[PDB]
Amino acid sequence: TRQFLIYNEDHKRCVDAVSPSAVQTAACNQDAESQKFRWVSESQIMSVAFKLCLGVPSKTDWVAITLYACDSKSEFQKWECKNDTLLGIKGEDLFFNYGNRQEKNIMLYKGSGLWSRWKIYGTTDNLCSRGYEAMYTLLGNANGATCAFPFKFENKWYADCTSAGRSDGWLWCGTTTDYDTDKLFGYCPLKFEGSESLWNKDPLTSVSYQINSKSALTWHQARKSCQQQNAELLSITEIHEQTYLTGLTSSLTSGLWIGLNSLSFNSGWQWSDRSPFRYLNWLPGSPSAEPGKSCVSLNPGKNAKWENLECVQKLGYICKKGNTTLNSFVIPSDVPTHCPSQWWPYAGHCYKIHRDEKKIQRDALTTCRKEGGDLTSIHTIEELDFIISQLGYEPNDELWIGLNDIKIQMYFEWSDGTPVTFTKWLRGEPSHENNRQEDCVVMKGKDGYWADRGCEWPLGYICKMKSREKGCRKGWKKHHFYCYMIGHTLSTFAEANQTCNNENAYLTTIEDRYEQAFLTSFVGLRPEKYFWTGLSDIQTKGTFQWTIEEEVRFTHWNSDMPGRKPGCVAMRTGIAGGLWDVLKCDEKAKFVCKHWAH
Template sequence: KAIFIFFFLTSSFALVYIPLTFSNIDTSVFLIYNQDHKLCVEAQTSNYVTSSPCNYKNVAQKFRWISEHQLISVSLKLCLGVSTKVSWTPVTLYPCDTTSALQQWECRNDTLFAIQGTDLYFNYGNRNEKRIMLYHGSGAWSRWKVYGTKDDLCSRGYEDMFTLKGNSEGAPCVFPFQYDGNWYAECTTVGRSDNWRWCATTRNYDTDKKYGFCPLNCKFLQQLWDTDPLSNIQYQVNSNAALTWYQASKSCQQQNADLLGITELREQMYLTGLTSKLTSELWCGLNSLDFNSGWQWTGTHPFRYLNWAPGSPSPEPGKNCATFHPGKGAKWENQECDKKFGYICKKGNSTLNTYIIPTGRLLNTTGYDKSAVHVVIHLFHRYEQAYLTSLIGLRPETYFWIGLSDLEEKGTFKWTNGEAVKFTHWNSEMPGRKVGCVAMRTGIAGGLWDLLTCETKAKFVCKHLALGVTPPPVPTTTPAPTCPDEWGSSDQRSVCYKAFTKGDEKKSWAEAQSFCVAIGGDLASISSLKEERSLQRYLSQPFLTVGYTEPNNYNGVEHCAEINGNTRMRWNDVHCDEAYYWICQVKKGIQLKPEPTNPPLPSKFLTIDGWLVNGDKQYYFNTNKMPMDKAREFCKKNFGDLTVIEGNTERRFLTKYVDSYFIGLQVSLDKKVSWMDGTPVQYVAWAPHEPNFANNDENCVVIYKNTGLWNDINCGYPTPFICERHNNSVNATVAPTPVPVRGGCPDSWLLFENKCYKMFGFKAEDQKTWDAARTACQGSEDGGNLATIPNEKVQAFLTYHLNNLPMDAWIGLNDINQEQMYLWTDGSGLHYTNWADGFPLTGYEGDRDDCVAIKIRPSKEAGTWRHFRCSSSKSYICQANTNPKYSLPPSTTPAPRIRYNNSSYFFIETKMTWKDAQLICQRQNSDLASILDPFSQSLLWLQVSKYKSPLWIGLNSNVTDGQYTWIDKFKFKYTNWASGEPKQNFGCVYLDLDGMWKTGSCEQKYFPLCKHSDVKPPTEPPQLPGRCPESLETPWIPFRGHCYHFESSSKMNWAKASLTCLQLGASLVSVSDAAEAHFLTENLEPLESKAPTFWIGMYKNLKGDWLWLDQSAVDFVNWNTGEPSSHNSEHCVEMYSSSGTWNNAYCSTYLGYICKQPKSNLLSWFGKGLREQFSFSAPFMEKHCHHYWIRW
């Protein structure tokens, strides 16, 4: 037959259009225009904003967005704002403050422009005033456009401009920024002899010296691109950057490029050579962020070539972005998109073309004229298949619909034109057992068929007969008997099957058989292996009851059978009273009878408040999942308790109503059982191999619906529960809640909220694994367990006392019994968590790390939780109940002064304004308190709860140049802002009752919290005269009299790193004091994703002495806890990016590294002299230094 094939690729045939365009936000300068006045806004001075005839050349009329809601005057480098949110307030200019609500503007419908969150509008001219005013009216004088357009002011916008090269790891520009005493609202060439446009990445370049080059169109930026001579495609390798995938993608788009897409082997080989000197991962454009499309490149790059590293893409959730890894043979790996790496941009003729993907749903295409066109193609043989593959195989789309589906009968595929299926070309693991429609793949799997849901959107292929060709007549046949709708057909017999798996409706074997008989059939029977395979298509649940008995007869009571609906189709005999889904069979062609319905429970068996009456007892089935203590509390409030099951009859009665519910049985540590209400245990019904007391913390019991048998479980596991009460107990007086036994704690234990706590593991030999730590706690004289943290107060109490522990401390939380189900080992409910950022992990790492510890270092993360391998040795915290045999310490009033960490704190119980509070503190040789870490934060919050009043602390942006810095001059690193803070225009900060920092009016009156520190705050080290080298490839950051280069992209062993620094005129870094160590840590923290550790210049010589490579004196060290270790051959020193602490390691390890050299005008013996003394060739130096380090 002659066949014409059509590809529906143009918009005239498309059912849905998805324009995939990359449109960067227009961030350019603009004039603010009022159409009614025909005037533009002009900022004549900071206090006088008016309007005048529009003039593009007048810089006073130019504005631009510098954040999502802030407008800056390009001429004055100040932001538009108001002094108060009151109508008829002048609009003036202020130093830009991202925290000020009085500088936040937003667009409204129909070109209105207002202070954010108010109905107060930017206004001019309605009262003949000369200035721009804030006004509640929304007339024509409050409507503003971008001059020369019909668009509102928000048609121009702001987006982070990510820098290139420089020394800021690709961080975005910050506008306005200060350089050499002047403010800049745009990128500038000032200060550069090469005319490259640059910006600062912090507000004050003069202080921080952090900068990068702006990705603006100019000829100079072409130097940053490498061109493939064969394809003329350009690549930009930003190995020194540290951006998330989204930021990297935006950085490329800002250069009219895409993140890297690799479409063929030759391109892969070119990039492998281009990045051969690098070892760190680099973001590329591969991602699976569109969960309906799988992995794909950004831009227009087709996904037709694969080069995944072994084990990638890994299945962990969240790893939806890919990296190009030069250190692993340039293979690809999937990572979390929020990690920070370098990246590669790509641009060429195909980049950033706007294109349209016409798509259609298979079920929506049937409206075409089938007399002319078969809607989607049907294929008869491999030659037609090969022809189609050649046409679509290299297209960028993923799928093309063909006319095959099993919609009419699950598992039986038919062509849409009714012709027989004589040829298939399935992809691996296809078609599976789901109902769907068939599409042909493109790319590396080009031509193979996948089964998709019919609602998936894809291109499609059509064909019809050539002119003059007619199809053969279809022979008439007598229709064979068919199966009812939603029933499946047997391949061996004239019967139909249906699995009944709806909701929670399950039945015993007898109930299922009765159901099947009632509709005209029986429970399914299986007569052969082929029929079993046929039946497998209809099983979607793991177990279903079938009419076949195969004895194992466990305990002599298993006389019915179930079948496992997985690929193995195993049978198992079970108790006939167990409830499962079921499969019925009927003869083909039969008219089904109506399905029987379960009669509703007669209302006379329910009490008014919903309790089920059975004899003298009433039961309440609570489906809300709670830990046992909360469940029992609920029952007692309703005059009952968790249920007591006293015999088999009662057990079977309850089984009809439950799934997995708490009952009132408890298991003690010695495996003895008792009913919680004191009823003697005369009957038990344990499931096989139960109670197993898994993880030694399963002390409560649940009853299962399927069997009615019992299983022990951790009391903290959230579970539904059954309450029980007697008829005569209803409306009785509720028993009062037992008063906790008051008592004290043993010596050296800490009392808090009627619990005793003690920290262990101050010495390495006292640290234990999680299980050994729990055993030690339980073995204490008064019994106990690893600590449970039920709320914020206990968390704060423990955090405050952790400061002296040398390492992280075990607590009782774990997911040993079930992955990602974290439970307290003492059975308490999990009502509060304090996970560190990024935890708990899922996937492989999370599966291995089952036990939870509270973190001690770095200090900014102190008190947060993370999981570790249970076999790790750590400090630990024990908890025990108070005991009356120990005297209870006398109650005390809050101490007038609290000593902590070289500081003393005191409270003045008189409410006053912030200014008065600071004055009264100063009179006592103190300041309002600075809070420098989570330890002191925890201590002070506990004090706030005692005073039951907020407290002023030492933050007031009004007296520190608009920024929040501590009034006592200590470094502002740790913060504990409440959600959305700082958000008010009020510059004064108080510590609230919930422990969070909040801003408020400085005239509000609170108690002062004063602090006297025994140590002086560190002063900002002065920048000594001199310059650092200017290099695009090797950025340097100045600090005091030296320059520093942080290399995170090209990892090396210690010897090669020291040689590389030497070739740069520098040395591996030495650290002279805490200020320098702090500077290094601040710059390493953003690089942690790329390089968790960096080489420094310390090494151990043959005598065992630790020395600096640049021969500086070793008069300062910053070893991590337990370091340096005594492991053989660990003779070189690395620095942790997260904390700045040191660890000795094998010199052959490949790490990042830090180089250090004096500023240019300070070069003396170390610079010029050292290079003169060692003026060998690079190969000679590498060879001999390498051998030298092996001898050490």
């Protein structure tokens, strides 16, 4: 219930609703309910005191805005922020204005003056900052449908979640505009006395679980229901987790949604909360090869096992609220690098790829231990991208790694005893585990992602052990034909382009998949949040070019980049793995220079 007041600085008077046919301005008051407003849709603004939306008689010049009955299809009630702080009707350039022509009622107007721009009281942001978000109910008889604001309960209009009609303060809402007629309702996912009883808390791991067997949402809807509760769709990472949930869902049979999905087209199966997919528990015949089934459901009737279905089915879902973090692996840039011959260092470990004599996994595991190491374990995306970039890895390689489930089937563990905190499966992997007794994992593909197969095939392997200049300058690491540097002075993009040019270099370009992979490992394990690069749209807004004028034949953009956002590109560290974000060029962050060899 994020209500807000609205006023204009050039007059310092808050909009006040007095009558459904008269909306004026009075003295600003935080307690006067007649001045509170909140969005109820992507465009509809509603009053809290009268439970009525703001609209216009018709999209024409100089008409009085008043309180109308809230209607979803009403084109006259849809608003939109334009340019900066201007507030106008969705479709035309008619604005929310007050002050002109001695009219105490706020008027729709054509003039773009300061009398038509409104901010939120107590802040400096426009009205499109908060906005309406779909709120999915819990339990109830409405199958977890979204709240409908406003709704009529016992001939009274309510604007937010209410405890009326109940004697236990349980907040609830009506999923339809007329509850007295439809009697469809649900409980609001908000903090109230007793809301903790909706979560089941494992006394061991302290992780909390919510089981909504009465709801019936899609996968994308179920994820949004858990996200809005500071949670996420269920992820099962241990045998104890699968066992604890089997007891909770022992009395249920209706299928429930979990976080396991394959929606990412480049990778394989993955959890919604980015947890490592190392524990498998598919039903027989699952996962199926149907191209449309990309979301996994937990079937409590068939012994809590998993099956993949279409992401559009309406089933229950399980939320997972927990604070458990796998590890940090942050290195305050510091690590030893005493590696033997033919081995290469990274983050305190020595790696080596064996392409010479292809052996099976058990012979590869023995050979790595003969040399004082072990089959490689991978814990970060940075460490994975170091292997493909610096170890002479080729796109058509197939190399063994330490991931296996020889001890317990369907439960992958690292051969070197280290915990499994990271997984990157290939498109369509893991698959066909029921066809064999031991599932060993390999590295193949241009991106070096993983795939599980039989353990009885001669292949290359990658060994890894502890720690016990080159063709260029001192503080410059060398990758392939170039040498790169990390500036330690937090500077802007302008200041960064100078320091790189000061050292006869330049902000690093990114030409292929592996130079990006190297740069992903060259930074990303350091506590800094962003690292600059060469891409920017200063030459021509909308088009990106390097600062040394080379062809831009590679793109490593983030989730929602770039498009509308103008600025300077910078790589993101941590779990993102060097993805390109667009930031304001006046922001201060470290950078990476680049220079040719010798």
